[PDB]
């Protein structure tokens, strides 16, 4: 936004030239506007935020333009210093056959995030591969997971 269009320039989109005919009353003063959000690839459904939302973002595939297919990795968000792109950490235990033990290992991964999301390092996330999106990125964040749709909302009902 920024009272539409935040950035220096709009974008075009693969779907934005206008069906200037339909004048739908603002239902409950909504209406609400068509968008490009979609069935999301090899399964699931986007946030309401895509469809209802009004950001933009090219590097997004979700509301936008890239395509995810192949491994879908899950990760802990590990860096968001950088804008609208995140980096998640994957710790994992690396087993030594001879010693019959495991040692802690990890690897960091930049994955682009669609703007409709909003995670913080730590956050558990599910990202998917894509044609390179950036030098470092061939992944795009796909859903920021959480527990019981709300992560502990009833046992937190605080004091005064």
């Amino acid at each position: 936004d920024l009272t539409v269009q935040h950035e220096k320039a709009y974008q075009r989109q693969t779907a934005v030239n206008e069906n200037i005919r339909t004048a739908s009353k603002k239902h409950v003063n909504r209406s609400g506007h068509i968008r490009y959000s979609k069935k999301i690839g090899l399964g699931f459904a986007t946030p309401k935020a895509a469809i209802n939302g009004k950001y933009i973002d090219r590097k997004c595939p979700f509301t936008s333009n890239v395509s995810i297919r192949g491994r879908i990795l899950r990760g802990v968000v590990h860096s968001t210093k950088m804008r609208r792109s995140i980096v998640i950490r994957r710790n994992y235990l690396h087993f030594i056959r001879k010693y019959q033990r495991y040692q802690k290992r990890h690897r960091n991964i930049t994955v682009h995030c669609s703007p409709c999301f909003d995670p913080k390092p730590g956050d558990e996330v599910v990202v998917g591969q894509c044609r390179p999106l950036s030098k470092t990125i061939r992944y795009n964040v796909l859903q920021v997971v959480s527990k019981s749709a709300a992560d502990k909302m009833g046992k937190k009902f605080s004091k005064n």
Binding site: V4, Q5, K8, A9, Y10, R12, N17, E18, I20, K135, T136
Partner: protein, 194 residues
């Protein structure tokens, strides 16, 4: 030649990145072409494996496509007005995807004028004409609202548009008229650097 590699850049531990073998020809690209407004010299180049890609030097007319009116007319690219990037770029009239031009408008005028029957300043094909010309208008009057402003652009035949192809790649640029909010904005922007 020039390799399209990520690999020669820092391995992002800062980590040095090194050489194994080749500068691979398959990843060899070409340095920036990009036409400059005027009369073509465009080269089909025998591109990867074969195949042509069109290598534009200079270009002059377009097919300005009326996004909101769905017919497109072939016309002058009368001029570039903005290159998002750069004042030099506009100045050099080196045309790129999304380059913002200025169109002739007469066809499009005519077109409206043909289609609906109506114009702004001229009358060339009006007089050619009950009526089945009674229709052209009946249609229009069923419902159009054009932009005013667009009309005005048409009067002076100098009308803004955005390119829908990658000239520097394709050698060709046609485009569709710049529009709306974006246009307002770009009008704003247009005015906001004096």
């Amino acid at each position: 030649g020039i390799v399209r590699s990520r690999l020669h850049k820092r391995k992002i531990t800062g980590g040095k990145t090194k050489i194994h073998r080749k500068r691979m020809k398959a990843e060899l690209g070409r340095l920036p072409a990009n036409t400059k407004l005027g009369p073509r010299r465009v080269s089909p180049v025998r591109a990867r494996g074969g195949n042509f890609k069109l290598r534009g030097l200079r270009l002059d007319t377009g097919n300005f496509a009326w996004g909101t009116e769905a017919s497109a007319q072939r016309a002058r690219i009368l001029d570039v007005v903005y290159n998002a990037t750069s004042n030099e770029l506009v100045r050099t009239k080196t045309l790129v995807k999304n380059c913002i031009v200025v169109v002739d408008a007469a066809p499009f005028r005519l077109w409206y004028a043909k289609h609906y029957g109506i114009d702004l300043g001229a009358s060339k094909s009006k007089k050619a004409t009950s009526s089945k010309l009674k229709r052209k208008w009946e249609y229009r009057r069923k419902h159009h609202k054009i932009e005013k402003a667009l009309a005005d652009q048409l009067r002076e035949g100098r009308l803004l548009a955005r390119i829908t192809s990658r000239p520097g790649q394709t050698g060709r640029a046609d485009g569709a008229l710049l529009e709306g909010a974006e246009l307002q904005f770009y009008l704003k922007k247009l005015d906001k650097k004096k």
